[PDB]
């Protein structure tokens, strides 16, 4: 017996607040990405990189956000890192809007974002993916999954776990209103190492969990246990992350150091 009572309306207001803030913080939404990927937008059709000849044309004529490395695999990887550094800033801006978050101890805010940004990056990356590939340069290009897989070792396997995650995750058909609450749940995780004060984090999480549950009930009439399934994904996501980390160390051991993002070069 669900009712539309004061408590439920406050959880809906919380969900809308998050949605609005998510729209502000993340320019390329899932709705806008799906419209591009399904050819149901009036916006500019992206350039497709599906082989090396199209990569060269893409970098040349179109100019993609990726002394540059002479090798394609390294330019791609470095581009992904750079974009992820920008993603940290977007995610931090979003975290400031979660009610209660900025009233936490600053060191705990930091620690929550430090351990949560990689999970949120991979969650939101799925929005830009379909079975064929991923949107790049804010939707101006599209790079195929099979092209990414064809990069020389160790870069050929770099995106594959993200695509594998995405196929299954996208099958749940979450929308941006669902995702805004989900990513707030991930940020307010009380089990991150090195947290000072866990209960206030858990109290914010509990309210966000309530809001997610209700959002999912109202928005997904045909998946009665979607809440549980999403919590299971958060359990998963930690593995894309645990395995990115292993991959990175192989990369940093065996490849030339690549350029630092300007923001870091500036920080030191």
């Amino acid at each position: 017996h669900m009712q539309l009572n004061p408590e439920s309306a406050d959880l809906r207001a919380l969900a809308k607040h998050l949605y609005d803030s998510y729209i502000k913080s993340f320019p390329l939404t899932k709705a806008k990405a799906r419209a591009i990927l399904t050819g149901k937008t009036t916006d500019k059709s992206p350039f497709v990189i599906y082989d090396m000849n199209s990569l060269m044309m893409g970098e040349d004529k179109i100019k993609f956000k990726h002394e540059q490395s002479k090798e394609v695999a390294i330019r791609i990887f470095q581009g992904c890192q750079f974009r992820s550094v920008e993603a940290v800033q977007e995610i931090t801006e979003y975290a400031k809007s979660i009610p209660g978050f900025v009233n936490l101890d600053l060191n705990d805010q930091v620690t929550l974002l430090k351990y949560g940004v990689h999970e949120i990056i991979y969650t939101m990356l799925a929005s830009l993916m379909n079975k064929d590939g991923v949107l790049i340069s804010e939707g101006q290009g599209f790079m195929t999954r099979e092209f990414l897989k064809s990069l020389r070792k160790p870069f050929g396997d770099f995106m594959e776990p993200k695509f594998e995650f995405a196929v299954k995750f996208n099958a749940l058909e979450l929308d941006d209103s669902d995702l805004a609450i989900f990513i707030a749940v991930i940020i307010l995780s009380g089990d991150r190492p090195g947290l000072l004060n866990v209960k206030p984090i858990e109290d914010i999480q509990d309210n966000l969990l309530q809001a997610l549950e209700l959002q999912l009930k109202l928005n997904h009439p045909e998946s009665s246990q979607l809440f549980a399934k999403l919590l299971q994904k958060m359990t998963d996501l930690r593995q894309i992350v645990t395995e990115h980390v292993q991959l990175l160390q192989v990369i940093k051991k065996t490849e030339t150091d690549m350029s630092l993002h300007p923001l870091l070069q500036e920080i030191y």
Binding site: V85, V88, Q89, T92, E93, A95, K96, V102, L106, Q109, V110, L113, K114, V117, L263, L264, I267, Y268
Partner: peptide, 12 residues
Amino acid sequence: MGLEAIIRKALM
């Protein structure tokens, strides 16, 4: 380290 400096600045 850098990750942490990125975040602190963004929060400020």
